[PDB]
Design a protein around this ligand. Structure first.
Ligand SMILES: NCCc1c[nH]cn1
Length: 175
């Protein structure tokens, strides 16, 4: 049993997890939308989630990721560092998932449903003590690519979509 988009022959070309993780090294990726409200790490009604990486390890297909985020329990931006490794899920031959490992050893395995050069549509299976759902991440929180947005809306049908990282997360300019 697995999502119908988890068809490697059909969709694998757009589900390259290692390529997507390395992309976090060049540009910050912002989670612009999601279909769920709570994350065990980011908190409740979490918003303003972004990530940047460094320390690419080709032998391990892992990076060190630095996250920023907000939730309804603190008015200040929060930060955390986690290791993320490209792994295989749903019988795939080429890595199509992200295995996050927090400093306390907690593990989350999410799956790339669709990914293009500057955006990712990620599926949260809901088996890591968390809510099942989808996330949309992109490098520019103000200009969302239509291809990823359409794929996110397509796969996330029947749920309640909400904004996560938007310009409201920052107070931009001066004076
Ligand atoms: N679906 C996001 C799970 C996660 C990873 N790190 C923190 N939370």
């Amino acid at each position: 049993n697995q999502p119908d988009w988890a068809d490697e022959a059909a969709n694998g070309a757009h589900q390259d997890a290692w390529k997507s993780l390395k992309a976090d090294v060049e540009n910050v990726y912002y989670m612009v939308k999601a279909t769920y409200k709570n994350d065990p790490v980011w908190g409740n009604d979490f918003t303003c989630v972004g990530v940047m990486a460094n320390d690419v390890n080709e032998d391990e297909k892992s990076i060190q990721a630095e996250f920023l985020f907000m939730n309804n329990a603190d008015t200040n931006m929060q930060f955390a560092t986690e290791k993320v490794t490209a792994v295989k899920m749903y019988g795939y031959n080429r890595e199509n998932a992200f295995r996050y490992e927090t400093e306390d050893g907690q593990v989350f395995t999410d799956v790339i449903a669709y990914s293009d050069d500057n955006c990712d549509v990620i599926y949260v299976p809901g088996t890591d003590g968390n809510e099942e759902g989808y996330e949309l991440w992109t490098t520019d929180y103000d200009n969302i690519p239509a291809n990823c947005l359409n794929k996110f809306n397509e796969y996330a049908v029947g749920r309640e979509t909400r904004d996560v990282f938007t310009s409201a997360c920052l107070e931009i300019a001066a004076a």
